[PDB]
Enzyme design. Structure first.
Site, PDB file in Angstrom:
ATOM      1  N   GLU A  15     -98.102  21.699  -9.882  1.00 54.88           N
ATOM      2  CA  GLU A  15     -97.866  20.407  -9.243  1.00 54.88           C
ATOM      3  C   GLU A  15     -98.714  20.222  -7.997  1.00 54.88           C
ATOM      4  OE1 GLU A  15     -94.090  19.987  -7.215  1.00 54.88           O
ATOM      5  OE2 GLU A  15     -94.061  17.849  -7.446  1.00 54.88           O
TER       6      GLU A  15
ATOM      7  N   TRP B 237     -92.382  15.554 -13.412  1.00 56.33           N
ATOM      8  CA  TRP B 237     -92.579  14.110 -13.218  1.00 56.33           C
ATOM      9  C   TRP B 237     -92.394  13.168 -14.401  1.00 56.33           C
ATOM     10  CZ3 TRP B 237     -93.516  12.009  -8.346  1.00 56.33           C
ATOM     11  CH2 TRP B 237     -93.656  12.967  -7.322  1.00 56.33           C
TER      12      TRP B 237
ATOM     13  N   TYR C   5     -98.064  11.167  -4.556  1.00 55.78           N
ATOM     14  CA  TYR C   5     -98.668  12.016  -3.538  1.00 55.78           C
ATOM     15  C   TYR C   5    -100.186  12.215  -3.637  1.00 55.78           C
ATOM     16  CZ  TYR C   5     -93.899  12.900  -1.976  1.00 55.78           C
ATOM     17  OH  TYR C   5     -92.621  12.844  -1.458  1.00 55.78           O
TER      18      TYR C   5
ATOM     19  N   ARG D 278    -105.037  17.179  17.978  1.00 58.16           N
ATOM     20  CA  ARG D 278    -103.628  16.830  17.892  1.00 58.16           C
ATOM     21  C   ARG D 278    -103.459  15.602  16.988  1.00 58.16           C
ATOM     22  NH1 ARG D 278    -103.846  18.280  23.978  1.00 58.16           N
ATOM     23  NH2 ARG D 278    -104.567  16.145  24.393  1.00 58.16           N
TER      24      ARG D 278
ATOM     25  N   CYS E  57     -90.609  11.183  -0.152  1.00 63.52           N
ATOM     26  CA  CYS E  57     -89.606  11.973   0.555  1.00 63.52           C
ATOM     27  C   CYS E  57     -90.285  12.820   1.640  1.00 63.52           C
ATOM     28  CB  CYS E  57     -88.824  12.862  -0.412  1.00 63.52           C
ATOM     29  SG  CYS E  57     -87.579  11.972  -1.369  1.00 63.52           S
TER      30      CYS E  57
ATOM     31  N   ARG F  50     -88.035  12.844   5.231  1.00 60.45           N
ATOM     32  CA  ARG F  50     -87.012  11.834   5.493  1.00 60.45           C
ATOM     33  C   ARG F  50     -85.676  12.025   4.786  1.00 60.45           C
ATOM     34  NH1 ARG F  50     -85.918   7.666   1.550  1.00 60.45           N
ATOM     35  NH2 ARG F  50     -87.428   7.987  -0.140  1.00 60.45           N
ATOM     36  N   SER F  51     -85.732  12.532   3.562  1.00 61.03           N
ATOM     37  CA  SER F  51     -84.546  12.748   2.733  1.00 61.03           C
ATOM     38  C   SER F  51     -84.714  14.049   1.982  1.00 61.03           C
ATOM     39  CB  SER F  51     -84.430  11.633   1.707  1.00 61.03           C
ATOM     40  OG  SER F  51     -83.323  11.847   0.867  1.00 61.03           O
ATOM     41  N   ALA F  52     -83.643  14.826   1.860  1.00 55.59           N
ATOM     42  CA  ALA F  52     -83.747  16.099   1.147  1.00 55.59           C
ATOM     43  C   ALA F  52     -82.484  16.573   0.454  1.00 55.59           C
ATOM     44  CB  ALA F  52     -84.253  17.184   2.080  1.00 55.59           C
ATOM     45  N   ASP F  53     -82.686  17.218  -0.685  1.00 54.76           N
ATOM     46  CA  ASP F  53     -81.609  17.778  -1.479  1.00 54.76           C
ATOM     47  C   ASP F  53     -81.626  19.271  -1.165  1.00 54.76           C
ATOM     48  OD1 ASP F  53     -80.216  19.100  -3.602  1.00 54.76           O
ATOM     49  OD2 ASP F  53     -80.458  17.274  -4.820  1.00 54.76           O
TER      50      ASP F  53
ATOM     51  N   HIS G 191     -79.084  16.659   2.782  1.00 56.66           N
ATOM     52  CA  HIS G 191     -77.828  16.531   2.055  1.00 56.66           C
ATOM     53  C   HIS G 191     -77.594  17.492   0.918  1.00 56.66           C
ATOM     54  CE1 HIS G 191     -80.551  13.472   0.240  1.00 56.66           C
ATOM     55  NE2 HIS G 191     -79.934  13.723  -0.901  1.00 56.66           N
TER      56      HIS G 191
ATOM     57  N   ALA H  33     -77.745  15.380  -9.588  1.00 60.40           N
ATOM     58  CA  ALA H  33     -76.965  14.180  -9.328  1.00 60.40           C
ATOM     59  C   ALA H  33     -77.870  12.958  -9.419  1.00 60.40           C
ATOM     60  CB  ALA H  33     -76.321  14.264  -7.963  1.00 60.40           C
TER      61      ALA H  33
HETATM   62  O1  LIG Z   1     -87.411  18.254  -5.043  1.00 59.76           O
HETATM   63  C1  LIG Z   1     -86.835  17.241  -4.648  1.00 59.76           C
HETATM   64  C2  LIG Z   1     -86.696  16.016  -5.420  1.00 59.76           C
HETATM   65  C3  LIG Z   1     -85.983  14.945  -4.888  1.00 59.76           C
HETATM   66  N1  LIG Z   1     -85.409  15.024  -3.692  1.00 59.76           N
HETATM   67  C4  LIG Z   1     -84.398  13.946  -3.507  1.00 59.76           C
HETATM   68  C5  LIG Z   1     -84.024  13.481  -2.098  1.00 59.76           C
HETATM   69  C6  LIG Z   1     -82.939  12.465  -2.423  1.00 59.76           C
HETATM   70  O2  LIG Z   1     -81.826  13.242  -2.945  1.00 59.76           O
HETATM   71  C7  LIG Z   1     -83.499  11.586  -3.555  1.00 59.76           C
HETATM   72  C8  LIG Z   1     -84.219  10.355  -2.983  1.00 59.76           C
HETATM   73  O3  LIG Z   1     -83.256   9.364  -2.428  1.00 59.76           O
HETATM   74  P1  LIG Z   1     -83.706   8.138  -1.521  1.00 59.76           P
HETATM   75  O4  LIG Z   1     -84.146   8.783  -0.293  1.00 59.76           O
HETATM   76  O5  LIG Z   1     -84.854   7.448  -2.139  1.00 59.76           O
HETATM   77  O6  LIG Z   1     -82.669   7.147  -1.169  1.00 59.76           O
HETATM   78  O7  LIG Z   1     -84.489  12.578  -4.154  1.00 59.76           O
HETATM   79  C9  LIG Z   1     -85.515  16.171  -2.856  1.00 59.76           C
HETATM   80  O8  LIG Z   1     -85.060  16.313  -1.720  1.00 59.76           O
HETATM   81  N2  LIG Z   1     -86.235  17.224  -3.392  1.00 59.76           N
HETATM   82  O1  LIG Z   2     -96.280   8.391  28.307  1.00 61.62           O
HETATM   83  C1  LIG Z   2     -97.158   9.022  27.719  1.00 61.62           C
HETATM   84  C2  LIG Z   2     -98.562   8.645  27.681  1.00 61.62           C
HETATM   85  C3  LIG Z   2     -99.476   9.461  27.021  1.00 61.62           C
HETATM   86  N1  LIG Z   2     -99.095  10.592  26.437  1.00 61.62           N
HETATM   87  C4  LIG Z   2    -100.262  11.472  26.151  1.00 61.62           C
HETATM   88  C5  LIG Z   2    -100.180  12.515  25.035  1.00 61.62           C
HETATM   89  C6  LIG Z   2    -101.537  13.186  25.185  1.00 61.62           C
HETATM   90  O2  LIG Z   2    -101.480  13.891  26.457  1.00 61.62           O
HETATM   91  C7  LIG Z   2    -102.568  12.050  25.298  1.00 61.62           C
HETATM   92  C8  LIG Z   2    -103.117  11.673  23.913  1.00 61.62           C
HETATM   93  O3  LIG Z   2    -104.038  12.717  23.385  1.00 61.62           O
HETATM   94  P1  LIG Z   2    -104.531  12.749  21.874  1.00 61.62           P
HETATM   95  O4  LIG Z   2    -103.320  13.082  21.141  1.00 61.62           O
HETATM   96  O5  LIG Z   2    -104.988  11.407  21.464  1.00 61.62           O
HETATM   97  O6  LIG Z   2    -105.563  13.746  21.525  1.00 61.62           O
HETATM   98  O7  LIG Z   2    -101.656  10.959  25.847  1.00 61.62           O
HETATM   99  C9  LIG Z   2     -97.740  11.027  26.400  1.00 61.62           C
HETATM  100  O8  LIG Z   2     -97.291  12.030  25.844  1.00 61.62           O
HETATM  101  N2  LIG Z   2     -96.840  10.201  27.052  1.00 61.62           N
END
Ligand SMILES: O=c1ccn([C@H]2C[C@H](O)[C@@H](COP(=O)(O)O)O2)c(=O)[nH]1
Ligand SMILES: O=c1ccn([C@H]2C[C@H](O)[C@@H](COP(=O)(O)O)O2)c(=O)[nH]1
Lengths: 316, 316
Positions: free
Chosen positions: A60, A82, A146, A178, A198, A218-221, A259, A315
């Site tokens: 994958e 998939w 992806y 960075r 996800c 953002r979301s995880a099983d 979750h 599920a």
């Molecule tokens: O390997 C996998 C495959 C799927 N998901 C899960 C996360 C959620 O359980 C669901 C997506 O739900 P929504 O975030 O779209 O609402 O798929 C994982 O965390 N890991």
């Molecule tokens: O309130 C603020 C203003 C700026 N930055 C900083 C983060 C880094 O020090 C710089 C951005 O550097 P680069 O990530 O772009 O390389 O600005 C903060 O963290 N907080």
């Protein structure tokens, strides 16, 4: 041991997770915000407490690196992770002529005969995608997955951007940057997609000649998903390092909503009874450094001795 | 106390931060991956250990909510947090006719006369942007800043998307959604921008009728930046809750690269000598619920009794 964070994540979600009604039907014990870090110099974070099919992880991931978006590569390597996503398009096709197949999965997890009809069907679909070029090109291509998000972000002026290919260069010429970020979250698609990403975004970081990576999920099983995600990203961290002639640092896994579906509670408790073993060792082809041209043969796992697999109802 | 995570973040970066050569000239003690969480029911996380100008926080945030991108609103409220970004365009303008002003900031932090010339200039620029409509429209408009990213993401078919306006609806109709995300990171702009977004992406989360928010910050200045970011987002978390008739949960601040410029070491050590005091209390206009139509008058802070301000050289 090396994998304890994962276990601690499950332990914690059981302890203080709130019953959150998951969109499906299955309830979930969830938490918001969590971070785990795995030191990659100690071992590949492939769980020893439950057998995880590494083959499905490699195949994958490679698929992703090639910027591929067509199921065919997967079926070619016996990977069905998939299928359903592509299959759905088939049954929703104005060209589909056969059994109902509506709201499958849900009803496939109930009616045993339907489950058999559904399976016979899917098999014919997988066969087509493997032999019929036009068909594969038509239904076997997922599109916004992806692979294209990492390797072919679509620009306004009809262009395409190789996020990864660029980041990797960036690492080579600006290791202390960075801004080594790769996003899979695009606003204009997010509402129309059946499943917004996800693994939303990740960041590379270099220091002392060691390479780390942070994944915002953002979301995880916790039970069925996380063990795989840990490997995909631990491995990608290895591949980028290999090409960049850098060492591996840590994999930092940050979570949004973590979750555990209620239908997995007994299974996770059982896994906790187990005691982790020494982690396996990854090994990448030394004579090869272009990680995109990689193939199964060039990535090997050593000494992976897990406990037996734990089965549980997905599920949905 | 309520703000201890911030102090612990600074303590930790001093203890185990690696000397990473920041792109500038000033070195930095950095770490990769870190998470802090503030419980918003205990108090507004506005630091008591050092005076932080809340006015600059409110004014700037509101600017963002209006989807504004023009300095004028800021100067109108005595806010100069963004001047230099717009000013640079002026001096780089083919229309600019006056003193050198090249590589300012850097040389403005050295030559005292230049610093005075530079300041006299900037003043004339700020005056123009405030009175000359054409001028303001031309140089006072930054374009790709947080405001348009949150409120006007640009679509392929020339459209624009109100990420926030949509997410807030989503919260109201799908409170238990794991897709309440707002990204400020766009691949096709990221390379051409002078400063890709630091606050890269955030996620809302609702449960038990309490609203939390997670902020992934790719890069951060522990001393001069973080204290402000904590407030902006703690407050935005409050505003969305207010409109959504929901309570406040926690603010989870996840970091990519957290750093402390070497020219601030003495200043952070001093701040650590201090002992936090009870946190101030935020209060939003009850008769008003449309958070976009908000104005300074509708957001008040109670009982903020800090230690004196700590001055330090901005590294650039
Ligand atoms: O390997 C996998 C495959 C799927 N998901 C899960 C996360 C959620 O359980 C669901 C997506 O739900 P929504 O975030 O779209 O609402 O798929 C994982 O965390 N890991
Ligand atoms: O309130 C603020 C203003 C700026 N930055 C900083 C983060 C880094 O020090 C710089 C951005 O550097 P680069 O990530 O772009 O390389 O600005 C903060 O963290 N907080």
């Amino acid at each position: 041991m090396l994998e304890q964070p994962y276990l601690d994540l499950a332990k914690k979600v059981l302890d203080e997770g709130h019953f959150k009604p998951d969109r499906t039907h299955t309830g979930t014990y969830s938490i918001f915000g969590h971070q785990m870090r795995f030191d990659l110099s100690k071992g590949f974070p492939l769980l020893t407490t439950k057998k995880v099919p590494f083959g499905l992880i490699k195949s994958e991931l490679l698929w992703f690196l090639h910027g591929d978006t067509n199921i065919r590569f997967l079926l070619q390597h016996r990977n069905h992770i998939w299928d359903e996503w592509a299959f759905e398009k088939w049954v929703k096709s104005d060209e589909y002529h056969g059994p109902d197949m509506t709201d499958f999965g849900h009803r496939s997890q109930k009616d045993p005969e339907f489950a058999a009809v559904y399976h016979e069907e899917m098999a014919k679909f997988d066969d087509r995608v493997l032999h019929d070029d036009a068909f594969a090109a038509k239904y076997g291509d997922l599109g916004l997955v992806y692979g294209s998000q990492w390797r072919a972000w679509h620009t306004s002026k009809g262009d395409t951007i190789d996020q990864l290919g660029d980041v990797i260069e960036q690492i080579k010429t600006h290791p202390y940057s960075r801004r080594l970020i790769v996003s899979a979250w695009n606003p204009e698609d997010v509402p129309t997609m059946a499943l917004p990403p996800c693994h939303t975004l990740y960041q590379f970081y270099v220091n002392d000649g060691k390479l780390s990576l942070q994944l915002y999920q953002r979301s995880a099983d916790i039970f069925l998903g996380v063990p795989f995600i840990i490997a995909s990203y631990a491995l990608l961290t290895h591949l980028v390092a290999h090409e960049c002639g850098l060492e591996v640092g840590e994999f930092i896994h940050t979570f949004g909503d973590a979750h555990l579906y209620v239908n997995h509670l007994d299974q996770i408790k059982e896994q906790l009874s187990r005691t982790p073993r020494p982690a396996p060792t990854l090994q990448l082809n030394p004579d090869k450094h272009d990680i995109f041209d990689f193939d199964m043969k060039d990535i090997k796992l050593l000494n992976y001795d897990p406990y037996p697999a734990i089965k549980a109802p997905v599920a949905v």
